[PDB]
Amino acid sequence: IPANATNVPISIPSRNWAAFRGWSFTRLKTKETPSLGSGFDPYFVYSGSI
């Protein structure tokens, strides 16, 4: 969500929805969330509650 954006659209390509259950959602903040694909995050400078 860009800073001061009031809309974020999602487009998911056409694929099966076999055995689909609900959705959930919540909002986070960029500075507080590191990626788990990477082993280290040089840009992650926060040590509070994730």
Binding site: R21, G22, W23, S24
Partner: peptide, 17 residues
């Protein structure tokens, strides 16, 4: 969703082996 659980107890001391 958040919830999803389907692992829970459904429960010479032997028959045949």
């Amino acid at each position: 969703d958040i919830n999803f659980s389907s692992l829970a107890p459904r429960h010479s001391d032997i028959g045949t082996s």
